[PDB]
Nucleic acid binder design. Structure first.
Ligand SMILES: [Mn+2]
Ligand SMILES: [Mn+2]
Ligand SMILES: [Mn+2]
Length: 430
DNA sequence: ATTATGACGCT
DNA sequence: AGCGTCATA
């Protein structure tokens, strides 16, 4: 009763850009705006692989992972923008730089955790308290929440979508108790007001639209964000969790989309997040381990404690390329040529990083895949990164891998390499 | 022949 | 350290 923690101590948001690489290309090329459009890498093999899709194009059934030739079958007028190629490989610099534009704006409101190239978590707890103090018990107007959905509302005793949104928002605001500065629902609502402001700033200052979720923890904020994409934000309250989770497939929750999630379903014979509440913490720990078991026990009740890390910058800088099928590297000079291409991109990015961010990488990680394997990576080895010099890094990378070559004579490389990966890690202040 | 990443957990 | 899992454009 008075002691059961409800996980309502924080206000956390997740901001995720809409169709991000597409919007980056649409800003650059006005001819792509408000069109079915996708971003593609490479072109020779089946028209290239699609990695981002505008919402107009999604309406035709175009998806990520699709070959552009096949997407064109669904959507003959689909417009395509190509990822830059430099040194023989896709180069994602334009999108990393666009990401920094957005992260820097978000950082004006609060410390952020960069969670991907196009999204970040924000702990708004402190900012909410201060906004509450200057509000002085004044109610929150619907006009401050022009793009906000309240998950689970309207409900109880209009056939248009914006009409439903406002109806739910009205029911929510009507019920609020703005008199209590410690009320979690009120705190989320003020959180949502701040995120409207954040999202407006992002759009004003970059031209990019985004969606967001506001809840009491990262997992619920992430889940919330997706509920009303694009260009909208969603508040998931603590009280909304039982209904939301009662029909929510387990795989939809971040971290359960893989093998663990499938094992939860198989072992327990359930389908939805809500069904987990019927197991003791010890039962869940017995099947899924101490850590996972406690995490699941709390998560299915809407409670999660993972903090928003104060980290705006990636903590690794890497370069990788696949060599599929026929193109698998089978000679020494081929392996060495591509190591150099990767190393030169890495050097360029590392040197820029040092100037911008006052830090230096100290470890180089080299990874390969061998034809006939199984796994994204076959072998991973590290060595010292002491100088930002492409020729040295590529020579070092070769040294760490040279023994993987099974071939008798050393001009040839066997068995052929299907992937090379260089990653700089272990940053220190400089 | 989805590819190019990037973070965290296990032992 | 090296491997595995999960995630996202
Ligand atoms: Mn996105
Ligand atoms: Mn994202
Ligand atoms: Mn996505």
């Amino acid at each position: 009763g008075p002691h059961m923690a409800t996980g309502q101590d924080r206000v956390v948001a997740l901001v995720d850009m809409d169709c991000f690489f597409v919007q980056v290309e649409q800003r650059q090329n006005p001819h792509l705006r408000n069109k079915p459009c996708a971003v593609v890498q490479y072109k020779s093999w089946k028209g290239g692989g699609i990695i981002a899709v505008s919402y107009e194009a999604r309406a035709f059934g175009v998806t990520r992972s699709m070959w552009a030739d096949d997407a064109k079958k669904l959507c003959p007028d689909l417009l395509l923008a190509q990822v830059r190629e430099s040194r023989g490989k896709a180069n994602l610099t334009k999108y990393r730089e666009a990401s920094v534009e957005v992260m820097e704006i978000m950082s004006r409101f609060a410390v952020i955790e960069r969670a991907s190239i196009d999204e970040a978590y924000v702990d708004l707890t402190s900012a909410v308290q201060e906004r509450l103090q200057k509000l002085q018990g004044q109610p929150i107007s619907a006009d401050l929440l022009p793009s906000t959905y309240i998950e689970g509302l309207p409900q109880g005793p209009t056939v248009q979508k914006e009409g439903m949104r406002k109806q739910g928002l009205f029911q929510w605001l009507d019920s609020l108790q703005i008199d209590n500065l410690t009320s979690p629902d009120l705190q989320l609502t003020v959180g949502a007001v701040i995120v409207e402001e954040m999202r407006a700033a992002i759009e004003r200052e970059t031209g990019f639209q985004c969606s967001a979720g506001i809840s009491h923890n990262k997992v619920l904020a992430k889940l919330a964000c997706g509920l009303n994409k694009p260009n909208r934000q969603t508040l998931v309250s603590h009280g909304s969790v039982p209904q939301l989770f009662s029909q929510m497939p387990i795989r939809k929750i971040r971290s359960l989309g893989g093998k663990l999630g499938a094992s939860v379903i198989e072992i327990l014979g359930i389908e939805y997040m809500g069904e987990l509440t019927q197991f003791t913490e010890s039962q869940l720990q017995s099947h899924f381990g101490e850590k996972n078991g406690s995490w699941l026990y709390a998560m299915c009740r809407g409670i999660e404690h993972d903090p928003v890390k104060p980290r705006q910058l990636p903590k690794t800088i890497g370069c990788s390329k696949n060599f599929p099928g026929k193109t698998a590297l089978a000679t020494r000079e081929q392996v060495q040529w591509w190591l150099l291409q990767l190393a030169q991109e890495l050097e360029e990015r590392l040197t820029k990083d040092r100037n911008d961010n006052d830090r230096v990488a100290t470890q180089l990680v080299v990874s390969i895949r061998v034809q006939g394997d199984k796994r994204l990576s076959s072998l991973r080895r590290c060595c010292a990164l002491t100088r930002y010099d492409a020729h040295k890094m590529s020579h070092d990378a070769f040294t760490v891998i040279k023994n993987c070559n099974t071939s008798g004579i050393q001009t040839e490389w066997s068995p052929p390499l299907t992937m090379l990966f260089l990653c700089a890690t272990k940053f220190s202040a400089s």
